[PDB]
Amino acid sequence: EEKEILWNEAKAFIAACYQELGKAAEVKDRLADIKSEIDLTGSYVHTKEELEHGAKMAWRNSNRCIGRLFWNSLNVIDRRDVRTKEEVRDALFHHIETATNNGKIRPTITIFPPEEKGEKQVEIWNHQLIRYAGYESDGERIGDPASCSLTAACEELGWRGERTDFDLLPLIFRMKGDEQPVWYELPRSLVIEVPITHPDIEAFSDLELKWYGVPIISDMKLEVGGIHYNAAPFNGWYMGTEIGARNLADEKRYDKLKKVASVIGIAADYNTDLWKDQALVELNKAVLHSYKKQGVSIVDHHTAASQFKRFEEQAEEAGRKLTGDWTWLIPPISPAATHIFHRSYDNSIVKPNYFYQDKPYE
Amino acid sequence: EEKEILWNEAKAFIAACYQELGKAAEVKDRLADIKSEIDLTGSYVHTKEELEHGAKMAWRNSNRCIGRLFWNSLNVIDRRDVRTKEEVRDALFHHIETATNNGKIRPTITIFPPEEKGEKQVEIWNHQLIRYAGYESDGERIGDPASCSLTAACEELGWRGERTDFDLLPLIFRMKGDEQPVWYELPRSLVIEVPITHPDIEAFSDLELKWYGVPIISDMKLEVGGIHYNAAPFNGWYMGTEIGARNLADEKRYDKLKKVASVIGIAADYNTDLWKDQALVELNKAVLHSYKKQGVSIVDHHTAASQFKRFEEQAEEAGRKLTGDWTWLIPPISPAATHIFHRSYDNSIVKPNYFYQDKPYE
Numbered sequence A, B: 001e002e003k004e005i006l007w008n009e010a011k012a013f014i015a016a017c018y019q020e021l022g023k024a025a026e027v028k029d030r031l032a033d034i035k036s037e038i039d040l041t042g043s044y045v046h047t048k049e050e051l052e053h054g055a056k057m058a059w060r061n062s063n064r065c066i067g068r069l070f071w072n073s074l075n076v077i078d079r080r081d082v083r084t085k086e087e088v089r090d091a092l093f094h095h096i097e098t099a100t101n102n103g104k105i106r107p108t109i110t111i112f113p114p115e116e117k118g119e120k121q122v123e124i125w126n127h128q129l130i131r132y133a134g135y136e137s138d139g140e141r142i143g144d145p146a147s148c149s150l151t152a153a154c155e156e157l158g159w160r161g162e163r164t165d166f167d168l169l170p171l172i173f174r175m176k177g178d179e180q181p182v183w184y185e186l187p188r189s190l191v192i193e194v195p196i197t198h199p200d201i202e203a204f205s206d207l208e209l210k211w212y213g214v215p216i217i218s219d220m221k222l223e224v225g226g227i228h229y230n231a232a233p234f235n236g237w238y239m240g241t242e243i244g245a246r247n248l249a250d251e252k253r254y255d256k257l258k259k260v261a262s263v264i265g266i267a268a269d270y271n272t273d274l275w276k277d278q279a280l281v282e283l284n285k286a287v288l289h290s291y292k293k294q295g296v297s298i299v300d301h302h303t304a305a306s307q308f309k310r311f312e313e314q315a316e317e318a319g320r321k322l323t324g325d326w327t328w329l330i331p332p333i334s335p336a337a338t339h340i341f342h343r344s345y346d347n348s349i350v351k352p353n354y355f356y357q358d359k360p361y362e
């Protein structure tokens, strides 16, 4: 059955991919070649073209992604050649460098060897390649609570964080045949960070907030034509609200709203003062201003929704059904000020696509 | 089949209602009496108790309503006795007076005779009993665009608005046997309105914004035990965001954000300045401050979500499944600052409930 599922997904992917690439006449012989290779080997190897276009299609089919206008410009790095943890490490390092691009962020994915019999060749533990550690001991809370369980697991393995609120987690991943993962400290020269200041309010620097430049999701499975690339880290640039309205704002993350209200000089005592809303706006202004001042790519939620509207029009122009998850597309502040809020979206799953997978710790 | 659907809905409603009222032992004989009356008459009449508890249950089952904590305190006015348009008019007038309660708003529903063979006894045309007219002629836009088609229909019938941006629409409804509806101008002494000022920014009054005190939804069908009360206007009080983030903010409503930005002294030129977000916060602050200064009931979205959280806990305590529509429960500003955003809700339809019905104009 495994092989039948593979074949079915393969024929659907190859016909749609080759059609988009103006390569329709080659489907027949390519599908023949695939059917044999599946027969003979239990799987099949994607060509460079299939692999690149598949990763791009997967982004285009990502229902929760507002940044999909730029799906066709994805920079695909084919690292199916790696066999050593040193090669994996260097690949991850390179991905950080090339994607960061001195602040002018390049949407990028690095693709590692896929699962074989559902057996992972390479298993990445980080949620993002660059993220901050989190600690909770006897009432004492430091850093990013979303990172508490991975942090605890790294420290099991002999890593030790400095216990600032912004400790960079090491890269941590496991190789097929290894019982334990390895970890490598990130070279600080590879990691761009932005201090958060506000354009008008000087006291805002008293918060000593910062965030990293490039979010690189490293724990999702890329699925293309029945082949499961469980290790395939990818990045775009941030939408400001991800940092200003969630990472720094949520009570279960950095929980900064009360401190924000204090430095902007408003009381945080009455719901009817809308001090949370006001702190949200200033914090979010500060984040966009800071990334822009430093020369690090970022987009605001209004601009991003305007791009997504273009993505919708483009899909219609091309004859493709549009899919989307309304609950994730609406931004977490002023959602009704975007067109997204005022329409609905078909949440069907189309492949290729990126999927969640179980975490090896926890 | 109509009668079978009726009977089925009736037995489900009577058992659940009598159970909640500690009246379980009476279900059997009451259901007998109902089965006969359906047999003999084609329908059945609710008791005072059933009618009151049914309307309350319908509110409790309203998935899109964040204000449901207070479902059991609903004030139910039984107007199944009316036969004349003068009685209907006076009922609507009374509902406005008693619900307004000099600003200390009382959640209220007035229930008129139900449909018979799907034949309406009374057909209310207003979307709310109190709403502002809207006009669009040769590029010229006045008032509330959501009201353009009902306004045009009223003016068909010989009503004429003054063409301010805040013309009160007349009550308009039709009686069984009549070909045309009638309209009655609202006595201004019945309608409480609130001028919008801002607690800190004096210029905010230059916008000359106002809104009415009491939103009274007058076009939804109440369904209780298979009986269809198509005319059953109800009200609570406003959540501030309904006015400040939607009615006054949407581009297809009053579209005030650019004017708001100007009076609060910020530029409306750059998406990255988050001027829309900032204008939203100040406009929303102004609305809550204004209702509170006047002594007219209103709730902010944070307080309302905290109440709804209590509603959820109360449902669990009572053993009732909770249903909700996430897309409507999240407020339109700072949704992620409420607990609602961070959980999901079963959007199943449970009856009794309020439903949409086709508009007699358009």
Ligand code: HEM
Pocket (backbone or CB within 6 Å): A055, A059, A062, A064, A065, A066, A067, A068, A070, A074, A107, A108, A109, A234, A235, A236, A237, A238, A239, A242, A299, A304, A328, A354
């Ligand atoms: C170009 C810049 C991009 C922007 C501004 C952007 C924006 C976003 C945002 C704001 C989210 C919601 C994330 C959250 O709430 O945690 C998201 C989700 C997502 N984006 Fe994008 N994105 C971009 C590029 C990409 C790229 C390059 C890919 C893959 C090739 C991608 C795939 C996804 C996926 C799979 C999700 C959903 C993740 C999940 O379910 O947890 N995006 N995007």
Ligand code: HEM
Pocket (backbone or CB within 6 Å): B055, B059, B062, B064, B065, B066, B067, B068, B070, B074, B107, B108, B109, B234, B235, B236, B237, B238, B239, B242, B299, B304, B328, B354
């Ligand atoms: C006590 C004060 C109340 C508050 C603060 C409140 C709050 C709200 C809000 C903010 C909405 C969304 C409306 C929109 O976006 O247009 C809503 C929807 C709703 N509320 Fe309530 N509500 C209250 C009382 C009531 C009452 C008394 C009933 C009926 C007895 C009711 C039934 C509903 C229904 C049916 C909807 C959905 C309407 C639709 O689908 O268009 N609510 N409520």
Ligand SMILES: N=C(Nc1cccc(OCCOc2cccc(NC(=N)c3cccs3)c2)c1)c1cccs1
Pocket (backbone or CB within 6 Å): A215, A216, A217, A219, A220, A234, A235, A236, A237, A238, A239, A242, A356, A357, A358, A359
């Ligand atoms: N701008 C960005 N933001 C962004 C884009 C995509 C995802 C993202 O983070 C979302 C994290 O979401 C969750 C939520 C719950 C659990 C998890 N973890 C898992 N992978 C799961 C395992 C099992 C169930 S969920 C991830 C942030 C980008 C990063 C990379 C490309 S664009």
Ligand SMILES: N=C(Nc1cccc(OCCOc2cccc(NC(=N)c3cccs3)c2)c1)c1cccs1
Pocket (backbone or CB within 6 Å): B215, B216, B217, B219, B220, B234, B235, B236, B237, B238, B239, B242, B356, B357, B358, B359
């Ligand atoms: N605070 C309030 N706000 C509130 C509560 C409930 C509804 C509400 O207005 C929602 C209007 O929603 C729509 C949206 C689209 C169409 C319609 N009109 C119709 N009835 C339809 C006919 C056919 C399809 S929809 C109404 C506002 C209250 C008023 C009364 C009690 S609480």
Ligand SMILES: C[C@H](O)[C@H](O)[C@H]1CNc2nc(N)[nH]c(=O)c2N1
Pocket (backbone or CB within 6 Å): A341, A342, A343, A344, B327, B328, B329, B330
């Ligand atoms: C398409 C989308 O469901 C629609 O615009 C909804 C979104 N959520 C909403 N939520 C509320 N409370 N009121 C509304 O009018 C809407 N509009």
Ligand SMILES: C[C@H](O)[C@H](O)[C@H]1CNc2nc(N)[nH]c(=O)c2N1
Pocket (backbone or CB within 6 Å): A327, A328, A329, A330, B341, B342, B343, B344
């Ligand atoms: C329960 C709810 O679906 C959940 O909290 C979602 C809501 N929408 C979201 N939207 C985005 N972009 N990111 C998120 O993490 C979430 N969380």
Ligand SMILES: [Cl-]
Pocket (backbone or CB within 6 Å): A215, A242, A247
């Ligand atoms: Cl993030």
Ligand SMILES: [Cl-]
Pocket (backbone or CB within 6 Å): B215, B242, B247
């Ligand atoms: Cl309204």
